[PDB]
Write a protein that binds this ligand. Structure first.
Ligand SMILES: [Zn+2]
Lengths: 19, 27, 43, 112, 98
RNA sequence: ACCAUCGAAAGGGAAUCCGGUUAAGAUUCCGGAACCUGGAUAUGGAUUCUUCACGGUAACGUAACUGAAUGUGGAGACGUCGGCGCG
RNA sequence: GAACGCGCGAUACUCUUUGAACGCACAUUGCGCCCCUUGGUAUUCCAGGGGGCAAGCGU
């Protein structure tokens, strides 16, 4: 499947910058 | 019968297959 | 509901989730052609 | 010896429009368009025509009672009798085999 | 401590047409008058933008008659002709004369 | 859970027939007769002690005879040819 | 600019249908939705009118 639709792009990006 | 009436200009220049006008270019 | 907090475990879990999301994105985007699926079979 | 033709817009020999010839009370031969015949409902397991259920068009079922499109047995109107009997027997035997397997398992890990 | 939940969503969703305008003029041809005197039907000319409801209501309001039915057609010259059949309680000849 | 919309007057599709009538109109008008769909409602009957009905071994029959979420099945819905039977 | 009508637009010698053209479609006078209001027995139905619709496992 494609579960990524549980996160919007802005949330995913702002959590990627956390790493 | 390659052409029909054009709504924008009223000429028999609306290509039925292409759905475009060869006189006023609609739309 | 879970009332507990971790300092670095949360960051590691976030990193793992991001890695899984990126890997699934790569697999889904590369599986658009059946040739890749056939190649993976013999991989 | 009087020749008749279609009475509607379609001039072609399509399945949609079909013609019968009848003699009207005026003494003349006239055409009449015939509707498509209805199809008997079929069983959902074996595909055989269901027994005791009226054969109508899809929209003509909404104007008749439930006794004209059902059978008093379980799954009546959906599955025929033999399929229902097979379902009952299979379900009972599956449950019995499940019981037997559970007893055998309880025995086999009862050793330790 | 952080009080976070477990059961989360699998996918994230974003949180000028009156009675006088309707009826332009009656039709007074020989066929129309024959229909008036015989068929109890008034033949009128109406607008392109009027439907059977509006024609019926306009006839009822303007001529104070009961309308049985309205049958409308579009003429080759770009005008609409309406056959308005009235009820048996009214004589179309009387309404035509009046 | 999953994407607008367009694309068939020969594909799928709810339902109307006869008679008569004009200079030129007809399954459209007139006369008679009938169906389809949607809606609000009333009456009778059933829902049998008070609370969602019965019969037959069975195939099944009935004037009715509640049924949410959820999960399915049928009709729509489907190649071509040959002889035989029936209207 | 075009179409249809009586220089003009149903107020026609205010401004119809369009057009960059705008609710959606369109080679169709096809299909909707929203708010107010009026009439026909009318709380339900039907129709007319007016006016519109191109949060985060970041700090
Ligand atoms: Zn079966």
């Amino acid at each position: 499947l494609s579960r990524y639709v549980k996160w919007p792009e802005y949330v995913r990006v702002q959590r990627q910058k956390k790493i | 019968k390659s052409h029909t009436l054009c709504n924008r200009c009223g000429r028999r220049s609306f290509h039925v297959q292409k759905k475009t006008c060869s006189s006023c270019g609609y739309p | 509901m879970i009332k507990d907090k971790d300092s670095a475990a949360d960051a590691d879990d976030l990193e793992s989730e991001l890695n899984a999301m990126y890997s699934d994105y790569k697999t889904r985007r590369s599986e658009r052609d059946a040739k890749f699926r056939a190649k993976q079979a013999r991989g | 010896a009087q020749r008749v033709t279609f009475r509607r817009r379609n001039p072609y020999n399509t399945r949609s429009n079909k013609i019968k010839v009848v003699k009207t009370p005026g003494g003349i031969l006239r055409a009449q368009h015939v509707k498509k015949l209805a199809t008997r409902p079929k069983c959902g397991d074996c595909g055989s025509a269901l027994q005791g259920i009226s054969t109508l068009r899809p929209r003509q079922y909404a104007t008749v009672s439930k006794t004209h499109k059902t059978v008093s047995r379980a799954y009546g109107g959906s599955r025929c009798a033999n399929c229902v009997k097979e379902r009952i027997i299979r379900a009972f035997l599956i449950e019995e085999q499940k019981i037997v397997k559970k007893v055998v398992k309880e025995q086999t890990e009862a050793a330790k | 401590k952080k009080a976070l939940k477990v059961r989360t969503s699998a996918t994230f969703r974003l949180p000028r047409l009156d009675s006088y305008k309707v009826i332009e003029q009656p039709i007074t041809s020989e066929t129309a008058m024959k229909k008036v005197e015989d068929g109890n039907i008034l033949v009128f000319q109406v607008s392109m933008k009027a439907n059977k409801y509006q024609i019926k209501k306009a006839v009822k309001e303007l001529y104070e008659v009961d309308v049985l039915k309205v049958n409308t057609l579009v003429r080759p010259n770009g005008t609409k002709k309406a056959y308005v059949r009235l009820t048996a309680d009214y004589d179309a000849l009387d309404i035509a004369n009046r």
